[PDB]
Amino acid sequence: QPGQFSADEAGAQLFAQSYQSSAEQVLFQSVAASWAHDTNITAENARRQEEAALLSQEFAEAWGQKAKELYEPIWQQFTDPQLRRIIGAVRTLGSANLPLAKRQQYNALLSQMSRIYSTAKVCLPQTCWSLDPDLTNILASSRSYAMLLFAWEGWHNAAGIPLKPLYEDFTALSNEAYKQDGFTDTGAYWRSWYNSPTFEDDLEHLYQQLEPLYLNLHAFVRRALHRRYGDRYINLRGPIPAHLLGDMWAQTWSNIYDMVVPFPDKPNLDVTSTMLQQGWQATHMFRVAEEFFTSLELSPMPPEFWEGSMLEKPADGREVVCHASAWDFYNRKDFRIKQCTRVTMEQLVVVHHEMGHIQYFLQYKDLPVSLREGANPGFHEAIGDVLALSVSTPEHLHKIGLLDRVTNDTESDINYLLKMALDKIAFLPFGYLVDQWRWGVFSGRTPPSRYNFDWWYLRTKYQGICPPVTRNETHFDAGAKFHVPNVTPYIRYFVSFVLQFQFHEALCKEAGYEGPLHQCDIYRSTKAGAKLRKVLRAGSSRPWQEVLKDMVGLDALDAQPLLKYFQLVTQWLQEQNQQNGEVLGWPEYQWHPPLPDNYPE
Ligand SMILES: *[C@@H]1O[C@H](CO)[C@@H](O[C@@H]2O[C@H](CO)[C@@H](O)[C@H](O)[C@H]2NC(C)=O)[C@H](O)[C@H]1NC(C)=O
Ligand SMILES: *[C@@H]1O[C@H](CO[C@@H]2O[C@@H](C)[C@@H](O)[C@@H](O)[C@@H]2O)[C@@H](O)[C@H](O)[C@H]1NC(C)=O
Ligand SMILES: [Ca+2]
Ligand SMILES: [Cl-]
Ligand SMILES: [Zn+2]
């Protein structure tokens, strides 16, 4: 239960300490119980994950209503701006304002929407495929239009449809809750984490500068799809069917790199085989990564990291979650990683990314728990990726003894950037739109009667894609993407994509590097590390604009560092598109591809 504190700013400082102190114990339980589950999926452990979660709601309610009984009408016009937000957070009760039975209704909807997603199956005319790895693989590897069309249509129908009636009731209750906290809708509350009165306009001006890069990549890749699939399925002036980009959601188009290779005569960069020959196992891949940070004079992994982490899939027939993730137990003691690591090149990069999340934790663990977060929701993924921007370059792989010779031809530099663009450039329109759709549902502009209409309106407006089958309003294609039924903000991922290349430009300049930006490697740069150490140890204890300015010199998001990065492959794509007489964009916006002859037979 909460304590007894005064109703002024000087006593608020006391209400924080006791609150921050008790939050450790409660926060630690919620992370410890999820760990005992995600590394050992048993029903009994899943039931402990819920008890620890409900125990957190009780803590946030009790300490939130207390905060609201004391300082509610006098915390806004406060002295210390750090306290202005700490108590501002505590007073926000979200679902605790709802009546008791609805609070139950709110949670049950979260529980059912997540489960409905994980257990959605695509059964055949016979056995049934699942999202991971069955359907994911098909969408990446298969090159039969009719096949890809079956996985795409089957999954969206399976996952989307049953989620719509639940999502409506969730939106209705999510908004009732956060209005009692002073917000027009949940969206306004989400968007308030960035403290930017012109946030949505700043995001549109960002993408307006980025759109030329995607329209070029769009046409270039659309021509590649025209050769493989023909004219009956690829309109050179219309949208691209949404199942021919190697990804279920077209987020990234990296699994169709074998179709768009600028120069296939040059060898693909893949040091995976070399790693196996030198005897690298998972544990060594992390020791290598740990050394990347210590070269920057950053913190090494503490003993608890090695003791507790899960660096390999367990051998004792334990059901685990294999997706790589980094865990902060909010006790300044236990930091771990759970990853079914595999001795591959991509995994080596992933291990550095996930270790960035750790280095972040370690650097700000001396702050109050409320400030053990990134500067804004889009920082963690920006720190993990900016590191991977150095570790993925052949320059670095050569220095850690994984690439004997470093080629210098520009043709190979175009293949590297193109492979990058299929991840960093193709995702921008998607990371931008996902929350735009939710912002519309939360505000009301997108009532349940127009879930799929506004969904595909955005998908066609930004990604330049279209459904390969006809869709009406019984379908809820927005729910077929994990982050929707699981209620996970998405605009942060569009932000980190912009942020990282800002972090990269700065860290490379600080390291003294000169030359093509994509060939930069901050490895063994102690001046680059000190710059990171400033950002990482700040957490959220300062405005993210300040931190970014101290690090990058600019107090806002700027897409120019990203454009400068892809400067070479951008010009090369404009030349290819003009030699082909391409039409950037999709003027024939009403176009949809016909069904394959006698489908799905
Ligand atoms: C995975 O979770 C299960 C619980 O669902 C663990 O099984 C328990 O383990 C403790 C520790 O030895 C025993 O005292 C309990 O009797 C076990 N309960 C059941 C129902 O078997 C299991 O140990 C966990 N995995 C690992 C590797 O410890
Ligand atoms: C909505 O769609 C349902 C599924 O049928 C598929 O979509 C329609 C639009 C056609 O393209 C059809 O060839 C597809 O197989 C229909 O069963 C339903 O009647 C449609 N209309 C509604 C729900 O009002
Ligand atoms: Ca991801
Ligand atoms: Cl966010
Ligand atoms: Zn990450």
Author numbering: 6 to 131, 135 to 609
Task: Please give me the paper's original passages concerning this structure.
Angiotensin‐1‐converting enzyme (ACE) is a key enzyme in the renin–angiotensin–aldosterone and kinin systems where it cleaves angiotensin I and bradykinin peptides, respectively. However, ACE also participates in numerous other physiological functions, can hydrolyse many peptide substrates and has various exo‐ and endopeptidase activities. ACE achieves this complexity by containing two homologous catalytic domains (N‐ and C‐domains), which exhibit different substrate specificities. Analysis of these structures provides important insights into how structural features of the ACE domains are able to accommodate the wide variety of substrates and allow different peptidase activities.
An open S2_S′‐mutant N‐domain structure (2.80 Å) includes mutated residues in the S2 and S′ subsites that effect ligand binding, but are distal to the binding site.
